[PDB]
């Protein structure tokens, strides 16, 4: 059950300085990358084109190449329209894509954020603001909804292109997505005992401090932190009194270990 995200971020510093960069994720694997610096979108995987032919990719990337230039100009003009109400610096973020379910079921989204606040989404047939959004955005939204061409294209992209494309990606990237890399663990202290776990994919993992059979309820699991090689890092910390570290261990369960859990006795 996977989610495809096209995360775009745009930063307008002056009237005449901006940049827009994009990255694309399928679950937690990056599949595309588009620097302001490059005229073209880059694949970060072998299978990033999906089941699309070369001709369909060209047509699709050209749409984006024109989007980026047009997007930049529009924003710059929309600033001029609202001036002096909102001025630079301006940060703009899109989050666009489609979550995929079994059968044919999908849900496509396109959320826009302004200065870090989610303000606009594309819904059904048009752009609309969301609860909390300023009232001044009604003029921008009225102007963006005036552009019937953009609306039709965006409708096609959300309703058809995204789910078709992602169904393609999932077949082509099957082996990288179903990947099974094993965690490696190690111990340390500072007393707070730390069980480091690293190298594991996919993201679901279980880490507990075990005094033999009994689970130590004080085990504080941290955040999942990324490694560079598209695997994960996690550490669980237990808080103890000194001299009490005998008969204590860290048990780690993961899909790749195949029943054979990692046990580190301290």
């Amino acid at each position, epitope marked *: 059950n996977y989610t495809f995200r096209c995360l775009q971020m745009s930063s307008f510093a002056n009237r005449s300085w901006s940049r827009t960069d994009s990255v694309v994720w399928l679950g937690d694997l990056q599949t595309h990358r588009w620097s302001n610096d490059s005229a073209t979108i880059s694949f970060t995987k072998p299978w990033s084109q999906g089941k699309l032919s070369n001709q369909q990719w060209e047509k699709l990337q050209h749409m984006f190449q024109v989007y980026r230039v*047009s997007f930049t100009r*529009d924003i710059q003009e929309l600033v001029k329209m609202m001036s002096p109400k909102e001025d630079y610096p301006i940060e703009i973020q899109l989050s666009a894509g489609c979550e995929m379910y079994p059968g044919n079921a999908s849900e496509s989204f396109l959320h826009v954020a302004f200065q870090g606040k989610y303000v606009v989404r594309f819904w059904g047939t048009s752009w609309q603001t969301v609860p909390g959004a300023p009232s001044w955005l009604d003029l921008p939204i009225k102007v963006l909804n*005036a552009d019937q*061409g953009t609306s039709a294209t965006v409708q096609m992209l959300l309703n058809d292109t995204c789910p078709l494309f992602v169904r393609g990606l999932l077949e082509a990237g099957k082996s990288d997505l179903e990947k099974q890399e094993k965690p490696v663990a190690w111990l340390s202290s500072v007393r707070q005992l730390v069980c480091h776990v690293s190298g594991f994919y996919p993201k679901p993992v279980w880490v507990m401090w075990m005094r033999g059979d009994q689970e130590q309820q004080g085990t504080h699991r941290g955040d999942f932190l990324p490694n560079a090689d598209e695997t994960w890092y996690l550490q669980a910390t237990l808080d103890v009194e000194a001299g009490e570290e005998a008969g204590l261990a860290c048990r780690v369960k993961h899909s790749s270990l195949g029943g054979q859990d990692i046990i580190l006795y301290w």
Partner: T-cell receptor
Amino acid sequence: TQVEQSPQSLVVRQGENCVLQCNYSVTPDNHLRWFKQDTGKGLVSLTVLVDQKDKTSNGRYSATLDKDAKHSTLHITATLLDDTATYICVVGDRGSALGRLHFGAGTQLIVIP
Amino acid sequence: AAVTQSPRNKVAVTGGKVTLSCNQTNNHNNMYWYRQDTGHGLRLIHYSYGAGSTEKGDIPDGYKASRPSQENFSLILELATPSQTSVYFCASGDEGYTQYFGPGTRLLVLE
């Protein structure tokens, strides 16, 4: 100069047809409009083409647009003396007021009565 | 959706102040000023997105704009030159693409 028209000028006898060319490099190309301008006066819109492959009519004026080609033509059937005028091609790059209009320098028609 | 211009015609001297006015009762937020010159298409000088706004277009040099109200958008030449001899055109429009053009203003700047 992203909007080029052809011929620059042309002379025809009353009753004859003519074809006016507009080729453009503008990106994107939301819509193309054909204006009529009598000498001295101002801009009467004749038609506006919007689709990828579009075809419009307005009496004796008809026109085409192919956006892959970035090419439009205006066909005038059975020229009348009043058609003596400059015919101007305009490409708008948005379907909203955020757009910019890119104007051709026009094709001058003279109809001999 | 009508747009008027005044004056319709003007003879001015080099260095004089000329003001070309454009009025519009459509309640259009947006107004635009072009100039027409033989061998070129219409070219944008200034535009406005509402009262109090004035933006530079493609060839703004020599021209100041002013949008005192929703109704009026003026083009001001402080120190007219002979090169500003042209036929000026004002237009307006709402959020859509269509710009509704005025009848035009001839200007001749003599030495």
